[PDB]
Swiss-Prot record, chain A:
It is found in: Virion; Host cytoplasm. The chain holds residues 394 to 451 of 2293 of the full protein. Forms an icosahedral capsid of pseudo T=3 symmetry with capsid proteins VP2 and VP3. Together they form an icosahedral capsid composed of 60 copies of each VP1, VP2, and VP3, with a diameter of approximately 300 Angstroms. VP4 lies on the inner surface of the protein shell formed by VP1, VP2 and VP3. All the three latter proteins contain a beta-sheet structure called beta-barrel jelly roll. VP1 is situated at the 12 fivefold axes, whereas VP2 and VP3 are located at the quasi-sixfold axes. It comes from Mengo encephalomyocarditis virus. This is Capsid protein VP3.
Curated annotation (Swiss-Prot), chains B, C:
The chain holds residues 394 to 624 of 2293 of the full protein. It comes from Mengo encephalomyocarditis virus. Disulfide bonds join 86-88. It is found in: Virion; Host cytoplasm. This is Capsid protein VP3. Coiled coil: none annotated.
UniProtKB/Swiss-Prot annotation, chains D, E:
The chain holds residues 80 to 137 of 2293 of the full protein. This is Capsid protein VP4. Myristoylation is required during RNA encapsidation and formation of the mature virus particle. Lies on the inner surface of the capsid shell. After binding to the host receptor, the capsid undergoes conformational changes. Capsid protein VP4 is released, capsid protein VP1 N-terminus is externalized, and together, they shape a pore in the host membrane through which the viral genome is translocated into the host cell cytoplasm. After genome has been released, the channel shrinks. RNA binds at residues 14, 16, 18, 21.
Amino acid sequence: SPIPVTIREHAGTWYSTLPDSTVPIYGKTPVAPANYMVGEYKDFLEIAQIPTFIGNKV
Amino acid sequence: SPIPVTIREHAGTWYSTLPDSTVPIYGKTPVAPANYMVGEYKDFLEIAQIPTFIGNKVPNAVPYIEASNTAVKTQPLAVYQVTLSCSCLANTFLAALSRNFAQYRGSLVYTFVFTGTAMMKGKFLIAYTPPGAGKPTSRDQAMQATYAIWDLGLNSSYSFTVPFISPTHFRMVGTDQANITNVDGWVTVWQLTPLTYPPGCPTSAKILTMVSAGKDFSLKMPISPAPWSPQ
Amino acid sequence: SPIPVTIREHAGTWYSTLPDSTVPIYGKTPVAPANYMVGEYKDFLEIAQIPTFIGNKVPNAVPYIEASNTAVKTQPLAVYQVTLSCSCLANTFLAALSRNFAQYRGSLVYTFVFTGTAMMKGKFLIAYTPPGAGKPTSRDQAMQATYAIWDLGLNSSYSFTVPFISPTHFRMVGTDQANITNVDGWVTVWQLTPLTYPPGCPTSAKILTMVSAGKDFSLKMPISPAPWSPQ
Amino acid sequence: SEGNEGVIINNFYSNQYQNSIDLSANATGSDPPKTYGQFSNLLSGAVNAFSNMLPLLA
Amino acid sequence: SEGNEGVIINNFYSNQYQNSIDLSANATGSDPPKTYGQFSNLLSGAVNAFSNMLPLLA
């Protein structure tokens, strides 16, 4: 009844960009409501559209 | 048919607060029925509401303040900082409970029990001053903030609630260093009218002081205070 | 597609009592039919109910007590402590069974078989004294506790049940050290009336003493007693 | 409430094993089951009725 | 009853593998199956009926 596993060669590696989460150590923590907040953006493209200054005579 | 697994980098670690269980080694053990039992509670908030004694005149603490036969607008009977760290609250269940959490929110209740003679009479001005301009220095300045007038008569005590006035949703429980002129303001007690009495009666009385949580009060994130020794 | 796992800190441990199975190495093995078999039991409680012999006069144990032709209210015929550890019970199946568990609950049954002559007559007072005031010192004190009068006649034995009287739901099986004046009380056997007989008959008789569990009796938490050698 | 456990998976060990078993005792006692299993020695011929009977004393 | 096992999961190895196989023998015996498989050598032409027959002795 214990389940048999095959350990992959890459056992133990850490991937800086792994598409996954790790162990939570301090659960059930409610946050401070931040619902009055304004000005949020979600995609850089949302603001890449605002013109900024080109430098002349560098 | 054996299943392939990828071992995570954190293999082998122990987390003191893991949201999970371990290996059971002695199953199917029935317990001794404890169904006759009474008095159980399940949330600390359930008892944080019971008032305990504030220590006056530290380190020669007494559970009360003294009213006199003189009203000096310049002289508070008591000045408490509104901090769950006040040495004043150090031994109240509120403070002992609170020291195991990082933040609090909600109402604090200061209860005063008059213990003088039935023949005495008097009026007190109890005020809560939010921070920003320092502590009030006379009843005249306190009277500019949140306050209540407590009249002595048939009913023995007065329950003063300091309203949670704060920029943040929560406030830190304990102080790191000491909190200045800060903290969250002050509760000051003043005489409005002096204690008056007839002939044959003492000229001062003791007022019992207690503190508790209001129905509003909340605590969050359990931690451990710095270890201490009561002696 | 290989599945990611988090290895727990206890990786590699062996638990002598794990509620689980291991790797099978020789499957599909049919057994030799044993279906003609009889006499099987499945719970120790099934046989703990069969009376076995109490040892009297340790370490020169005999399976009986002796009744005489004299009733001294000051002299018990036997005094057993109600402890599954009494050296008295040391070799009863009850005691041998019980020593593999931590706690017991329920009724203990002391059975007496009269083995004297048919011509003899007599009455015994068998009492159970709960703890608290020490063991009774005369039949007069025993008679103040739980007791039964056993009259000799056609029917040979008497089954005395000591009621489970205890503050806790369960009682510890074995003693750590020795149990004082404690233990759980005492079973004392006294003569009420002396053994009487006609001419031509012996003037004393042997009474066989056994012990068993009552239907009430329960045992819990299997452990191992301190190892011993019968020699 | 509950404690600090927040796993989605069903506990691998069943409860009677993962936890102690809360029992409750009723004030007035409880009757043992009638039988603890089927092991037994049997007494037969205990009584009478039937033999080379009534030649037998009164 | 059962022993000391209290896992929720279905045993990974099936029973015929995890345990011995209790069989029961009946008093009066049991008939082997008729055939143990389909391997066989065959005897043909064993008998008669049909040939350049009845010129054949009586």
